Design a protein around this nucleic acid. Sequence first.
DNA 1: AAAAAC
DNA 2: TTTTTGC
DNA 3: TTTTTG
DNA 4: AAAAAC
DNA 5: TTTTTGC
DNA 6: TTTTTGC
Length: 338
Amino acid sequence: KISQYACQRRTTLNNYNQLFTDALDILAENDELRENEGSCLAFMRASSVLKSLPFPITSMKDTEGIPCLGDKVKSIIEGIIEDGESSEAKAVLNDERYKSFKLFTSVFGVGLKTAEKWFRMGFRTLSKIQSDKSLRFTQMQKAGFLYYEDLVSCVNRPEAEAVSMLVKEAVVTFLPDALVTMTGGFRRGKMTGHDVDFLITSPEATEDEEQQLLHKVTDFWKQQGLLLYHQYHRSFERSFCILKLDHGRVHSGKGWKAIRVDLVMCPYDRRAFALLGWTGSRQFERDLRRYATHERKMMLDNHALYDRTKRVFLEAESEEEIFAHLGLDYIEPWERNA
DNA sequence: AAAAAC
DNA sequence: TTTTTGC
DNA sequence: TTTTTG
DNA sequence: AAAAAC
DNA sequence: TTTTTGC
DNA sequence: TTTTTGC
Ligand SMILES: Nc1ccn([C@H]2CC[C@@H](COP(=O)(O)OP(=O)(O)OP(=O)(O)O)O2)c(=O)n1
Ligand SMILES: [Mg+2]
Ligand code: NA
């Protein structure tokens, strides 16, 4: 009955198995850092499936007929039932390598590789990293260290409501017909988020007006001294930012907060695919594509859906129509929290 | 790690 | 040349 | 056994 | 995209 | 996938 | 490196 695919599941933000999901989330993180990619996904899909249950697990008979729960996962579950916690997860949480990875990757511009690079140099604290004269920091790592306290506290719903107003005012100044949609975790009903994700598309605007808007907005914020960081990408068209949000703009110190803002600019003909692809979650995204490939012999990505059998690209003006192409029951954004 | 011959 | 960062 | 896992 | 040299 | 900066 | 399902 319950599917192994997050796209065939309704997952709201009401998790009755947080005890188990937290333990599986730690063990999947440990395997991601130890590069055991296979095992890492296995715990991520088991953690995901339990978030969809409309009740807490209180016995091993409750695990009956749930997919993705094999011999190992059932062991982690069983241990949490008897001793109230996972010995496995506890041993990981206390590991020197795991502790480093988490502290290091919390800095914006530091991933698994640099975290391991710094660990293989004997670094365990951020004070030691910053104190070092010999170390060479990238432009991103510099902003991550500069605005560390603000970026380590997640973005809340009123702060995201305010940032949405900044984007709206900026975008409409250079493209009045443009449509601005808040994507990511906030579209999915979340109250926290590491950043504020946006999707911008213009129906009337030209190609020239399209390949320049993100520059015109980021330069607009630059002039006002709001642009704390910017990294541009062209292909869709993406701009990763760190913005200065003044407390006065938030509808309820230093007077402002540094906030990560992800702005995607897509062509108006691909907005349904971009909206589905940037809403998330990451697990719903991969299970949608895994379903398309293995169950329907189709190819789904952020810009198009191709049917490999009918040898055609499928058109869609809404997310409703994409689920329909794939033979899936429509899952509203707030039921995509896999 | 758990499926799937994915 | 390959690697690293960001979804 | 090997393959896949967005 | 833009560095950094992992 | 194409800049720049160093080793 | 493990177990399951189904040719
Ligand atoms: N590996 C990833 C990461 C992200 N995304 C998509 C889905 C969500 C969207 C925005 O990504 P995030 O910034 O990571 O935001 P979020 O997942 O919604 O959560 P958070 O609140 O932490 O930003 O990009 C994805 O498909 N695959
Ligand atoms: Mg987000
Ligand atoms: Na990081």
